[PDB]
Structure formats: C-alpha cells, structure tokens
Amino acid sequence: ANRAYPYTRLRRNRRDDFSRRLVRENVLTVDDLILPVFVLDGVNQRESIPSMPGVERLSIDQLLIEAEEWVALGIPALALFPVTPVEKKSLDAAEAYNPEGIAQRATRALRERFPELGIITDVCLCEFTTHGQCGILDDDGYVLNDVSIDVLVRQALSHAEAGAQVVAPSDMMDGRIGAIREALESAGHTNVRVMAYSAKYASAYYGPFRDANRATYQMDPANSDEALHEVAADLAEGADMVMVKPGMPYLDIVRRVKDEFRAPTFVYQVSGEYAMHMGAIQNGWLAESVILESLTAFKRAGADGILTYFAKQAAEQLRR
Amino acid sequence: ANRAYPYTRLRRNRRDDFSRRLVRENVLTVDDLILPVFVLDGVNQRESIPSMPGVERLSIDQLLIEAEEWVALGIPALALFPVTPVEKKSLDAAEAYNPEGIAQRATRALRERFPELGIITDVCLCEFTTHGQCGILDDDGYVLNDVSIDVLVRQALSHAEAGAQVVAPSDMMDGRIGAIREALESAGHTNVRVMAYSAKYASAYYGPFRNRATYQMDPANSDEALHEVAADLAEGADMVMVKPGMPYLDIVRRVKDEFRAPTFVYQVSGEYAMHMGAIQNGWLAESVILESLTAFKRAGADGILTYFAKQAAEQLRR
Amino acid sequence: ANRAYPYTRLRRNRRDDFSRRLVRENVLTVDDLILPVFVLDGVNQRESIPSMPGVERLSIDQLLIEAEEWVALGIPALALFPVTPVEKKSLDAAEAYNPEGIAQRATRALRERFPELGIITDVCLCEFTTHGQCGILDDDGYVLNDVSIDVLVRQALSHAEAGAQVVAPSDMMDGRIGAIREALESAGHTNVRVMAYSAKYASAYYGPFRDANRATYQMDPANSDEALHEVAADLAEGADMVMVKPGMPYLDIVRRVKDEFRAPTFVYQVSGEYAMHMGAIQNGWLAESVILESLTAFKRAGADGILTYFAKQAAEQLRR
Amino acid sequence: ANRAYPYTRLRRNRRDDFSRRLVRENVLTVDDLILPVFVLDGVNQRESIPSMPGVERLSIDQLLIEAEEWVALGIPALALFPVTPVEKKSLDAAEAYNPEGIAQRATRALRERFPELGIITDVCLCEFTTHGQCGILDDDGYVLNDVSIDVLVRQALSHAEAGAQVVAPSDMMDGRIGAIREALESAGHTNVRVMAYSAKYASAYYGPFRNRATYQMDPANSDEALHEVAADLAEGADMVMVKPGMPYLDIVRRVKDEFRAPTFVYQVSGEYAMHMGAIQNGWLAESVILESLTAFKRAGADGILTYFAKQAAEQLRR
Amino acid sequence: ANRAYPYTRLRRNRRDDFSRRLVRENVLTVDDLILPVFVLDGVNQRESIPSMPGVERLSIDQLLIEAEEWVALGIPALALFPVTPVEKKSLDAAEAYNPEGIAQRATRALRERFPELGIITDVCLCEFTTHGQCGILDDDGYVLNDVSIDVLVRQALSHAEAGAQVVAPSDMMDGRIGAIREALESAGHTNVRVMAYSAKYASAYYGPFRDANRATYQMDPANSDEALHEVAADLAEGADMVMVKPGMPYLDIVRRVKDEFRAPTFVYQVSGEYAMHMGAIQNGWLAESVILESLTAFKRAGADGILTYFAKQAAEQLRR
Amino acid sequence: ANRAYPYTRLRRNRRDDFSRRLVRENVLTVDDLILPVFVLDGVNQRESIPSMPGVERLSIDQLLIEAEEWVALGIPALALFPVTPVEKKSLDAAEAYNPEGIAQRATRALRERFPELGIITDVCLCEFTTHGQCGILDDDGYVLNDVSIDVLVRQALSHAEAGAQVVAPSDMMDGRIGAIREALESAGHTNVRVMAYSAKYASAYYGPFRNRATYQMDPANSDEALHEVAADLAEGADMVMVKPGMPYLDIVRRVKDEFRAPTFVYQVSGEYAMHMGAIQNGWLAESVILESLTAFKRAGADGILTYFAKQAAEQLRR
Ligand SMILES: [Mg+2]
Ligand SMILES: [Mg+2]
Ligand SMILES: [Mg+2]
Ligand SMILES: [Mg+2]
Ligand SMILES: [Mg+2]
Ligand SMILES: [Mg+2]
Ligand SMILES: [Mg+2]
Ligand SMILES: [Mg+2]
Ligand SMILES: [Mg+2]
Ligand SMILES: [Mg+2]
Ligand SMILES: [Mg+2]
Ligand SMILES: [Mg+2]
Ligand SMILES: [Mg+2]
Ligand SMILES: [Mg+2]
Ligand SMILES: [Mg+2]
Ligand code: NA
Ligand code: NA
Ligand code: NA
Ligand code: NA
Ligand code: NA
Ligand code: NA
Ligand SMILES: [Zn+2]
Ligand SMILES: [Zn+2]
Ligand SMILES: [Zn+2]
Ligand SMILES: [Zn+2]
Ligand SMILES: [Zn+2]
Ligand SMILES: [Zn+2]
Fold first, then answer.
1. Secondary structure of F101-143 as H, E, C letters
2. B93: left (phi over 0), alpha (psi -120 to 50) or beta
3. Around Cβ A164, how many Cβ atoms within 10 Å?
4. With 0-12 CB in 10 A as exposed, 13-18 as middle and 19+ as buried, what is C244?
5. Number of compact structural domains in chain D
6. Which of A2, A303, B284, E143 has its CA 20 to 30 A from that of E273?
7. What residue ranges in chain F does DSSP mark as E strands?
8. What's the CATH code of the domain at E52?
C-alpha cells in the first residue's frame, strides 16, 4: 500500500507497551498446550531423565497425583508415551494392543479420575518391537506398510476401548489414517479423534526421547512440498487434526500446512528441543524467557496446539 | 482435501470441551479492548445517557477515578470523546484546537497519572461546529474538504502537545491522514500514532452517540473500503479502523485480508444500545457481549473500541 | 493502482445522489427476502411474542390470510416453524414426520392456496423432542449423529410429500445433507431443494425464538476456517443452497463462504437480531432506517437471500 | 466442492420462479442507466437518425422537455453529445472550449432546471475538428498527443465552469486524465468527476454515431486494457469505462475483477442499431433489450451508457 | 509495474502497423471456425431464411455440393442441425434416434465424401418433440430430466453409429454428459468426442433459429458463477470440449470458463447474433469489417473455436 | 474438475486432424517474426558466417535488395546489428553515436525505401569498444554503469534521428531504460519505442554472434528476471525481451504471466547454429524450425527475434 518512511515509521506502534499489546498478532494461552508424559509400569516409580532436566517418567499412581496440578493449571490434554518393559517387546508387537498394557491401563485410570482431561494415545509399534522400528519387518529388513497397519489398527482400537478421546498415529505408514478411521467407525467409536502425525521427519532432534531404516518412512528434512501431499492425504482419510514433528526446526512446514488446508494443525516440540533449551537455561546462556518465546513461535507459525514438555512451566507462567 | 463423511465428522472435535479448546481458532483478551469514554467539562460531575444504559459521561476528575479500575483490569487504552459546552461551538471550530479544551486537559491529566495507559484522542470538528457536521461548511452548506483539514491538523497537533500517544481522525475528509502525518513529522511528533477511521459509513447505528452522505461511506459499498484503507496506509496511518462494527464485519475481514495491517473496529453507540436494551429487557443473555466481541476477533480485528470493555475485561479476568 | 490524494478524492462520487447511485455496489430487492413464520395448531389463533415486537404466531387459517399480503408484496418464500403442542413432544420425535403435523398441514394448505409461493420447511428434531435438543439422545445424554439422521430423513420425506419445494435441515448433524439427498432422490423427489444450515453457530442470539449440549453440534463462535469445511461438505453432499446462522454477528462468514464457493448463499437474521433492533427502534434510540441498513449489509457481504422477520416491513419500504 | 450428479442437480433451483428469483446473481435497476443524447444547435428542433431508429437529435429546449420524463423515471444521468454546426469546425478545435458552445449551454440549462440530474459531458475534439479526428493533426496527418491534451484541458475546464458534475474524456490520448485532473484541481473544481474512457477500441461498431488505429485500441488486445485502466486510476479517474460494450464484455469483467473500481460500459450506436433493426424486422423479441443490459451487470459494470435507457427504465418500472 | 505517463505512452506501439502487429494479442484463423448448417429432407432443396440473410437450408445432396467449398476453404468442422418434417415429430421423440433420420443420413454421407471433415451432431429432442421442448414432458408439463437422458443417449449412440466424430448435447439436462459418455464407452465408441453445451442460457437471441418451460433447464442470463459449476460438472463427466451459448452477449462467461478450467472452450454465435449483424450491414449501418471484429472478440475472450454462420465469409476473408 | 479415465480420454481430441486443429492452443504467424541482420560497411558486399551456416552479413545495398523478399513475405521488422570496421573502435565508443555509422545509414535507407517495415536498432557499446565489452571500462577493468549510459543515450538519440521506430538496449546497464526514455521524451521523440533486453543472461549460447558476469544475468536465476523486467516497465519500456531464448523458455512464461506486457525473445546465434548444424548433418528434420518457434509462442512470447524468420515465413505462407 505504498507505505514509506517517514510517513510510515514502524517503530511508532513499538513505542509503548500499550500499542505493542494492541497490535500484537498472536498470543499463547493454556488452551494451546498438550503435555507429553512418559509412563512406567509398576507402583511408586519416578525416574529422572538426564538428557531432559526436570522431566520424570512416572508410574500410573504417580501420574495420577501429578495430573492434579496439570488439571488445576487448565492443561487441556496429555499425550501418553509408555515405557515398555524390555521383556514385553516382541517381533509381533502384540503388547501394542494388550488391554493390560501401560497405555491402556493409564488411559482407563485417567479417564476415570479426570473425566474432562483429554488423553491422546500414541499409535505406533516402535515401543513394542524388539528392533525398535515403527512397524513390522519383512524378511529383507524393511518395514512392511500394510502388515504394520493391521497391528496399528488393533492398537488404536484397544486405545478407544480404554476410553481415549484421541489416538495419534505416529508411525508414518502410508494409508494408516484411513485404515484406523474405518476401523473406528465400524466398531462404533464414532467420536474418537485421530491426530495424524502427518509430516514427521527423520530427525536428529529425537535423541533424548530414545534416552527417555527410518528414512524409508519418516520424511527427508530437505522436503517441504512433500509435506503438503502428506497432509492432504491424511485429511482425505479422515484425520481430525494434523501434526508436524519436530517443531522449531520445521516452523516453515507448520505455516505452509496451516495456510494450505486451514485445518486444526498441531506441532511437537520434541525431546531434543526441550533438552537444548533447558541446557542453555541451566548454563545461564539463555534467559528463562526463551521458553515462552519458543512457544509463541509455534502460534505465530499457525499452530493451534503444541505438544511440549514445557507445558506445565508455561502454564504456570501464563496463569500469572 | 476431499474430506467426506463419515471419514470426516466435524463433530468429533466438538465432542468435549478439551478438544473444542484445542481447535478454537480465536480468543478475545483484554489486550484487544479499547474503552471509549465521554468526557464532561465540569468537576464532580457525571451524567447518565438515556440511549446508552449503564454508560456515564464523566468529568475529568471522575475519569481519573474510574481509570483506576480500567488500568487494574489491564485495558490498554481509552478513546476520549469530549462533550463540548454549547457556548464553545462555532462555525470555525476553533475549540477543536484550544490547548485547554476538554480533550487536551483530559489527555494531560491521564498522561501524568497513568503514564502506561494509551490515550487515543478524536480528531474531528463535529463536537466543535455549531451545526454538528464533521467539517467546515461553505455558503452552500457543503462540508469543505481542504479547509476542514487545516483545522483538523491544528487539532491533532494540540493533542500531540498535550501528550496523546494516538490521534484518531474520524472526519472522513479525503487526504487528512497525510496532512496530519506531515504536520506531526514537521513538528517533531515522530512517535504519535495515527489511527485512521478509514472506512467510516453513513450509518443509522450512530443514533445514541448523538450532509453526511457526502463524506461518510454508503453502506452498500465494500470494494470502496479497500481503496479508502489503501490511501490511508500510503498516507502514513499506523492503524486503520472500520466504523460501525458488527454491521460491517465483512469489511473488517476484507481489510485485514487485503492489507495485513493493524486493523481496528468500533462497536458504536447504537450497537451497545441495542445489545444492552435486549439484555435489560431479558431478551438476550449476557453471554452475547463476549460473543459480539469474539466476532470482531474472528473477523480479523486486532483491537476493538467497545463501551463493553470494562465488563468484558471483568468477565475475561474470571 | 497508485491512487493518491488529491488526484484521487473518494468524496467526488459521494458529492451528489446521482453519482452515489451510479457507483452503489449492492442493492436489496424483494427477491432477497424470505419470511420466517411461527405456526400454531388450531383455528383462529394469533399470539404476540413479547421478545419480538410486531411478530405473531398464527394458526394455519390465519397464516393463509396473512400470506395474501406477503404474496402481493412479492416475498418469494416463507420459512415455516411449527410451534409443537407440548403433549406431542416425545423421546423419539415422531411428530417430526407425522403427515398430520403442523408443518405438513401448513405446507399442503399453502401449496394449494398460493402455488407460486416458496415453502421452506425446517428439518430438525428440536421442536419435537421433550428435551429440546436437535437430535436423539444416547444413554450418556449425547446427541447421536446417525440415529438422528434416520429421523431427519423421515421428516424431510414427509415435507416433500406435503409439497414443500425446499427442505432446510437446521440440525447440524454430520452427513445429514447427503443422507437426506439420497433419500429424496430414491423416493423420486428429484427437484426438492435442500437448503443446508451449513455454518450454524452455538449462539446467544437465539434467545427470543425459544421465547417464541449444543456445543457438541453447533459451531464455536470463535471459528471461521471451520465454516468453510462445513460448507464444502454440504455442497459435495448435494445442497442446493447453503446458509450461515446467525446473521449480522457472522457477516465475515457469509463473505468467506460466498467468496470461496460461489454458490447460492443464504443468511438468517435471527430472533435476537430482530428483537435488538426493534427494541432500540421502539425506544427511539435508532431510526427505522436501520432495518434496510441491516439487510443491505447481508447483500454487501455476499448473501443471495436473507431469512428475516423484517421481510414484510422491508418489502413495503422497497415497493415504494 | 466435489459437486456431482445426481446429488447435485443444477436444475432444482431453476424449477420454480421463486427459487430462480432467490438465487439470481444480478439485477438491473434504473440506478445503472445513463442516457446518451445528441444535442442540436437550434430551437424547436428535432432530427431523426437514419442509422438509429427511434433516437432523435434534440435542441436544448427539446432536451429539457424530454428530461422531464427521464427524471421522473429515475434515470440518474445523461451523457451529452453535441452535434456541431459545420461552420464552427476548425483545425484548432477551439469550439470545444467555447463557453457558449452546445455542450456548455446544454449543461447550464440542465443544471438549473434539474439540479439532481447528473450531466456527463464529452471531452474530445472529434466534433470540433474539420477532419473529425479526436485530436489535432500535425503536418504529416498524425494525431498529436500532447498538443491535443492542451485543448482537451481547456474543454474540460469549460464544462466544469458550466456546472457539469462529470467530464468524460473520450479521446484516447495518453496522459490526458492526469492533465485534466491537475487542471481541475488547480482551478478549484475539486468535485468534478472524471469518467475516463480507458479502454476505447478502434471498432466498426461506431458506424451510426458518425488514423484511429494510432490512438484507439486494437480489438485483439485484452491485457493492454488493464494497463490503460491502471494508468487512468493512478491519474485520478473517479470512474473508468470500456467502449464498445457487448463486443467487449470480457474486458468489462477483467477490468472490474482487477481493479474493483467504479466501472462503466458504453453500448454504442452500432449495438443499438443492430438490436433495434432486428426488433423492427421482427427477428428478435423486445426482451433482448433487458437481456443485453443484464449482460453488462453480470459482467461487472456499475453503470451503462445506453440509448435504450428510457425504454429499459419503463420496463423496469413495471 | 509503476508504469506512468510520459515514460509509458501506450500509443507508441499503436503508432505503426508493424508494431501493432508485433504486439497483437490474438488472431483469428480458419482453424477456429465451425459452420452450423440446416439440413432438409428430400432432394434438390434449397431454402432461404428471411431472418438470416444469406443462409440457406439444404437437402443432403445440396449440402454435399456446398461442402466442397467449405472443405477447400479449410473449415475444420460442420455442426449439423436437421429440419425435421412436422409429421415425424412425436411425443416420444423417437425420430431423434432413427438410423434413417436426416442427421444420421447426412452424417454418413459426409463422412464418406469428406473423411477429414469434422461432423458435430446435435444431441437434443427439441427438433423431434411435437411440443418443441428439449426433453420429454411429465404429466405436469415439466421436462423430465432422467427420462429425457434415456432418449438423448439413444440419439447420441445413433450419431456415433452413423460415423460422427463429435456429438454435442444441447439439451441442458443435468448429468447427460456422463450418461452419454458411459454409453459411448460401453458401446466401444471410445474416441467419439462430446462437446457439451455447458452454459446454455434461456436467451432471446435464439429468435431466427426457430424461424430457420425453458427457464427450468436453460440458464438465467443473470447468472455467471453458476456457469462455472455447470462446466465443472461436464468436465468431470467426461466432456472433451465445453461450450457457452449464446456468444457475444456472454463473452464474460467465455473468459471466466477459459480462465477457470483451461480446457477446450467453444462458443456459439447464434442465429440472432448473425441476423443483427447482417441486417445492420445490409442497411449500411455497419461496415462488413464488423464480422471479423465479432469473431476476434471470441478469440480474445478465450474461445478455442466458434460456431458461426459467418464461417464461410470469414474463411474467405482470412484466406486472402 | 475431477477429470478421470475412461470418462476423460485426452486422446479423443488428438484422434483427427480437424479436432487437433480446433483445440490447438497456439499458432505461429508471420506477425510474430523479427529478422536480425548483420550489416557491413561496404557496397556490393556479402560475407558468409562460419558458425552460422546460411546467414550472410550484408552491405546496405544488399540489405535493401533482400528486404524486398522480407517485406513481400510480411516480416514486420528487422533488428539491425552492425559489423563495425576495427579501425572505428575506441575506448570511448564514440562510433556508437556517429550519424554516419552503419546502423544510422542503414536505418535511414530502410526507412525511405520501405516506410512500413519496422527497424529495431541495437543500443549497446560492444561493437564500438576496442575491448568488446558492452560498456566503458574503468582503470580496473570494470564496466562502468553510469558513464556507459551517457554513451548509450547519445546512441539511442542518433538512432531516433535516423528514423528508427524502435531502439533496443542490449547492454544490461542498470537504469538505462529510464535514462534513454527521458532523453527521447526531452528531444521530442515521443513515439520511439524502447524494446528493453530486460533479462539478458551471461550465456555460452552467444558463441556464433561473436567481465560479462558483472552485468549479464547468472543462468541460475529466475526470480531475478522478474525484478529486472519490473524496473524496465516502470522506466518506460514499450516491450521487454528475454535473451537467449529456448534455454530460457521458463523465463518467457514467468515474465508474460507476471506482467502481461508485450514480451519478446531472442533465438540467438548459438541456437540457430546448433539447429542448422543438426539439420545439415541430417540429424534433425527441418520441421524442428517451426517447432522451436511454436515453443516461443506457447511460452507466452508476442514476438521472436530469429535468424530463421525468412524460412519460417516461407513455410507459413504454404
Ligand atoms: Mg502419510
Ligand atoms: Mg492460530
Ligand atoms: Mg470528588
Ligand atoms: Mg479516506
Ligand atoms: Mg488477529
Ligand atoms: Mg455439517
Ligand atoms: Mg450477490
Ligand atoms: Mg417549443
Ligand atoms: Mg490511456
Ligand atoms: Mg456490480
Ligand atoms: Mg449441466
Ligand atoms: Mg486461445
Ligand atoms: Mg549491386
Ligand atoms: Mg535491468
Ligand atoms: Mg501470445
Ligand atoms: Na489453540
Ligand atoms: Na489484539
Ligand atoms: Na437475491
Ligand atoms: Na449500478
Ligand atoms: Na482455435
Ligand atoms: Na505476436
Ligand atoms: Zn514409532
Ligand atoms: Zn465527526
Ligand atoms: Zn434444531
Ligand atoms: Zn472523439
Ligand atoms: Zn434442444
Ligand atoms: Zn553489447
């Protein structure tokens, strides 16, 4: 609109807090926060994670106790990540659909104790396979697409039976959203949401989660147009929400996905992003204000919700 | 993206509060609210406004008292509307630029007491002319464009010298934003913001605030609003505004979409009156206040001039 | 196009009525008006509505008499809203599809007496359920989507049999437009139009209609992109017209919907909007000219037609 | 939106008049109509035009009589086309700016009698030059751009001083809109509108109105029209026009779509002649008049210069 | 691009014929011309049409003789329009699919005599029904959509059997393009093109053709967005070309259709357009140069081909 | 529009010549062709060009003879390329603006003989400098921008005074279009067209025509070309050109799409050489000439500078 200095001085609106606040384009609220949480078997268990300062893996009993604060702070949902006992991992990943598995038990417990809290379960075989890949291997060592979907469907169904309001397939198999959706619909789980990990990259940023091949399924970091194709398919297949993972290193993908589809768009600030920031904060290299800066970035980029291990810290800062 | 029932059921996200909250596209906050306020000449004075139940005209001392609650609620700014004593009105509208006029005095008092509170003054001749038009009349009864600008310029300069952070020309003269900006820059008022009333319509919804069709816009016209805004941005506006508000939400959306600039909207006297009247008659629930304000946000407004600002602030602070 | 003052003065075209008229971008005509009308059981009944000054609920006999004026004024269509006797409300909503229900009786009477007048019937269960929700409840108190559609289909069919040229599903069940369309097509009701309430919000503006939960089906006022998804589905499912409700508070949605789909787009100026305006007019706070301003706004925003309780007043003002 | 038969049957809305009326995308109203009118020099004079059955050239007194019916029908404006006596033509086209020329006299008389009726005068040299070109010729027979503008400027100024609310340069000189606007502004004619003939083609459809290819546009060219309009808007046009009309409806649509500005179209003499001739021969029904005019609206025109304006007005008033 | 006088003078390129020719955006060639032609029963028949000066209706023998010139001039195709003997019109329109009907006989004759000349047959019932509507009536006098399609399919098949390379459904029934396409494909007529009359308006411009109700099927002249919906469906249904009718009065529709779909786009300069222009030319009110101006307009608006009764005149003018 | 096999078979339109002809999206005509021609200093002189089989350098008298066939074929314009005698080269490139230089003499002779034939002169210093760069060198060997413009301006003015209808600056100095336009306008050369070489790349395809990377564009860059064109249009170019041609067809398409302005493309010496060489070796059919030229049209070019112009004209005239 032919705006030119000195008629236009973009510093004017920056001059005072009031005008900065009036023109501010985005704000973070507790409604944007999802807390991922690592869940152990057993009772009275609490484990620190060295590569994620301040995050603990908790048994179900201890998770229920901590969920009091989280609920009180208004965090809308948790994303549950079981820590599978090694002995329960198998070639067939059958623990993924065990009604007595950690995720299923945790879901029923939380649904009963905190009925309004959203529970987002993780649909993937990587915590259940001996070999740690996201799906079932063929005799050449490749992760088989459609056979894996069979197991992921049973898993998702088991989560729905346990009471999960949202299942989030994090597997990157082709077509899994539609297969899971069909299965849910056929079984009568009409309102279980599917939060697709649509554009999940083959990333180095996942280090600490593993603490807490893939290029044939997860996306190449170099590719951006491809992510649009991914999301389009997941929306056609029935996803209720679509997600980009990891987060900060992919903010350009979040913006293109929101702009292109105008659908509910989520982003995961993964373990390595948390660890980088925490480490720098603890070293005194960055101020704690970087936490809300990092989260504001996701809102600015177009995300509706953020899976972040900072959810509690940020919710406290915001509640003030 | 070929979304089809029953694979896509748009009710699933609506099933639970938590998922409604996660997908909710817009939220109103106190940061979005600007309170207009009618300012009297006297002292220890308030007046009730018949056509605006619940709103009082306030003398400056009273404004300072109430501004305590407004600042504590976090309301970022006020928009000052003086109520000029009749005896101060004239064909030349000289009272508009009186250094000791209501607006100027109010501004200086607020700037001193509450230095962080934004003050948005009204640049217009309508409360200063004997006939009530927004500009100066020629012998034929036409509101003269360029002669009016000369008065408006001196007005704005007086507001700036009183300390106003924002001046808001509400006059709908052609070119006034540029003339005002030029004057502010030449006088050294580098940082005074100009909040243009860019698309201000010749509307029946101004009843309660109180030939206009020769300067305010025809309600029928939408494309024209984009031309208006474009000119005001090129002329140096820091913010642009649509008035009235709800009845023009389509204009808000087009203006935000087209220009991606800081965009404001005025929920005018008549919109307040019709909502309050209905709430007082028991015809509409009080929830309609927040719904009306959420609509502005959804449509693309960055901030909202609303006589409901204090109640909305109170509700949000719950 | 680099337009700049003083070469460009946008007041020039405003200088005279003639040039204002030449450049005026939108005009309201009686072709844009649909009159909603509340229909009572019985004979010789006329009831004023306190929260809607000047609107009356009428028995069929009295509706036929008033429809003379409406036809003479050129109003193209009515939208019928029965007032169901309380004793006829039920858990199963069966009165919705009674061939002798108020809507069905009213439709046959009007179709016979005024063959060119459009009749738009309301497809929804809320006037027929004891609990007043738009659909059938499950044992958890939730409004069941697909079971409700079964009843809405029978209702729509009964309206078609009665002679309605348009059925307007106002229910906000997912998929109902396609289900109704299939049913109409299968039954031979090839030319019955479906006027989808596509983007119908969970709004406070409906107060006076009730005088004259829902968040799990009606839309969140905060959401705009979601409305596009709603309309897209309804057009794919066969709607002939798409509608936004309420009206004024959603003019931005009307504009986005018209711009995005270029399809016949309708808007409902609901009971609370009528009451607000009437109340202010009767108090002398607004001039009567606000009525045609409010209606012009819908045209400007892109609506092709407006359901408005001001239809008669506006048609008289326009006929002059 | 994946609309597919038989779920989507586009005939359903066509089934009944009432639904056709509800979905109808465009309507012609009297507000859209501008009547061109050929104005003679004498008094108690009318002339029939062989190639335009049913249209009369009218002396000013006759124009005033007929303008009674035009105003009562609600026609907003007339476009005046003088028929210059041959003896007043010259190589310098000085008659164009004669204060007592036909156009000027007609304007003053209409402005006085019917103050609310818009008068759109024609700014062009073609009815004033001995050779009939729209501008002044050099020794080689080329229509000079800038020298022509100087005459056109004085013309426009004379029209403004006679009281014309709109001047419409129909000359297709480069830059003339800006030169005219500059002159009007410097003379204080702040509110005189300029209705540019922006995209005026070198067309065979002007037969009945009566080297042109060096100034009027090549019929083959579409993109070029957008460049023409762009320049005229930047130069200060209040309205822009395409001429001829029906044969250029694609241009109307592109111009409206691209610029969102007040857009006009001229249904020229040859288009009138061919429609009337066909109606008089019994080859086309009279309904073709309203269909032709609806086409302009559908294509995006805000207003239409049409010799059918009175009959269309009569038909609409039914 | 900030172009401003006097740096930019758009007259410079107009100064000389050479530069006008270099910058000229569109040209008409004989490849753009399709000649419609009225075909009589019998032998040695030639009839002038008073409302279309210079156009004759011809029996097949005389058509073959005239087609020599047309072929020699390079006209790519004819559009055949039979003149059905009144006695052969019926309620069932069965003459439409008679293998010995005028259109079928004419097609076989032309295909044999001029194998490279395109023949475009007219698929519609209006020349075959006693009542002259485009389809079959129901007992309320309405033109039935799907029953009409049954007859149009048999017609199109009969044209394909006769050797037509293109069938052009001019009926404006919903869905007919897909039904005809399915039928052609099933029967093995893999390469018969379908030239859909997609946006055919209810127009006064057809007068002279009739010399040589409809609002429930043909389009309202007022509607433009609706035409896009029409074309979209016809392309989805398998049309190879899409057409707007009438022509000049709808150039804005031609431009929107070409711009939106980028598909082969045709336009019909109908009988009334020909008659208007001829009449004015014969009266001396317009120069003959208007013919090529009118045709250039269609090219400029985006048409790939033009059905025009001026095809021979224009082809001669162009061949020079 | 959800087109799917077998409902949609894109071969159906390809089945027959007649349908291929009806749907064909672009056609080459003689109106699209501009012939470049190398012009010698002498008289009764021709020279064969080793790296451009079939093209002759021609003295002016020879050019006039051949121009007979070119005009009779309908070729609209020639682009003149003088071959400067070495002794006339200098560090100041003064020969560029010699009123009796090759280009000037050729222009005057053609303008007189064939008044309707367009002449496009080359505005560049490369055939006038001793070192062969397109501009004047500083002491460090850099091609100076603004000093070069001053020479180019005088060149262009000399071409205009010789009668050239189009001057085509091929130099790739920044700002030269504006400087040239300013000079032409101030001198009264109102109608002299400027055909800017807007996006002229530092290319290996100029081999046969005969630090360049500091002024000609990097082959890798596409977006940059739009910035180049934008500036030349704002500076007053009447036409804009991409060079080389085939290897840059994507640039042609983007430039036409973005600006909708008269767009030209140069099929350079190396493109001619590689096609002819292949045709002479029997490796490619002669049909490749028309295919190469159809590509330019398809990509969006309005006109094409091509050494094949005469043969293509001959082929089209079949
Ligand atoms: Mg995928
Ligand atoms: Mg957001
Ligand atoms: Mg006190
Ligand atoms: Mg303005
Ligand atoms: Mg916002
Ligand atoms: Mg829906
Ligand atoms: Mg509309
Ligand atoms: Mg008399
Ligand atoms: Mg121009
Ligand atoms: Mg319009
Ligand atoms: Mg169709
Ligand atoms: Mg084309
Ligand atoms: Mg010789
Ligand atoms: Mg450059
Ligand atoms: Mg081209
Ligand atoms: Na959110
Ligand atoms: Na804000
Ligand atoms: Na309408
Ligand atoms: Na209009
Ligand atoms: Na073609
Ligand atoms: Na060309
Ligand atoms: Zn996994
Ligand atoms: Zn004012
Ligand atoms: Zn309901
Ligand atoms: Zn003229
Ligand atoms: Zn037909
Ligand atoms: Zn060079």
1. CHHHHHHHHHHHHCCCCEEEEEECCCCCECCCCCCCECCCCCE
2. left
3. 27
4. buried
5. 1
6. E143
7. 33-40, 46-48, 56-59, 77-82, 118-123, 166-169, 193-200, 239-243, 263-267, 303-306
8. 3.20.20.70
Nearest C-alpha of chain A: how many angstroms from B303?
6
Say which of A2, A190, A262 has its CB closest to residue C225: A262
Q: In DSSP terms, which residues pair with B239 in a beta bridge?
A: B195
AA letter at B195: M
Is C19 in the D-facing interface, judged by CB distances under 8 Å?
A: yes
Beta strands in chain B (DSSP E): 33-40, 46-48, 56-59, 77-82, 118-123, 166-169, 193-200, 239-243, 263-267, 303-306
Over its C-alpha atoms, chain B yields an Rg (Å, rounded) of 20
Is D88 one of the annotated active-site residues of the chain? Answer: no
Q: Are E79 and E37 in contact (CB under 8 A)?
A: yes
Contact (Cβ atoms closer than 8 angstroms) between residue F24 and residue E31 = yes
Phi, psi (degrees; rounded to nearest 5) at F291? -65, -45
Q: What angle, rounded to 10 degrees, do the helices at B176-186 and B223-234 form?
A: 10
Distance from the alpha carbon of residue C204 to the mean position of ligand 24, in angstroms: 15
Cross-chain Cβ contact D31/C31 below 8 Å: no
Range of the domain at A203: 1-320
Chain A residues in contact with C228 by the CB 8 A cut-off are 262
C positions 183-202 inside 8 Å of E (CB): 190
**In angstroms, what is the span from residue C248 Cα to ligand 4's centroid?**
25
Interface of E with F in 254-273 (CB under 8 A): 261, 263-264, 266
Q: Which chain D residues contact residue C266 at CB under 8 A?
A: 22
d(CA B134, CA B129): 8
E229 touches C: beta carbon within 8 Å: yes
The three-class DSSP label of residue B82 is: strand
DSSP A191: T
Buried b (16+ CB within 10 A) or exposed e, C93-129: bbbbbbeebbbbbbbbbbbeebeebbbbbbbbbbbbb
- Flag whether residue C53 sits within 8 Å of chain B, measured between CB atoms: no
CA dist list (Å): A210 to A45, A152, A271, F111: 19, 21, 9, 81
DSSP character string of F57-100: EEEHHHHHHHHHHHHHHT--EEEEEE---GGG-BTT-GGGG-TT
- In angstroms, how far is CA F309 from the centroid of its own chain? 12
Across-strand partners of F143? F137
The chains in contact with chain C, meaning 3 or more Cβ pairs closer than 8 Å, are A, B, D, E
Measured between CB atoms, which of F8, F32, F116 is closest to E238?
F8
Phi, psi for residue A306 in degrees, rounded to 5: -130, 120
Closest CA to C142 of A193, A187, B7, B14: B14
Contact between B200 and B172 (Cβ < 8 Å): yes
CB-CB contact of F195 with F243 (8 Å): no
Is E220 within 8 Å of chain C by CB? no
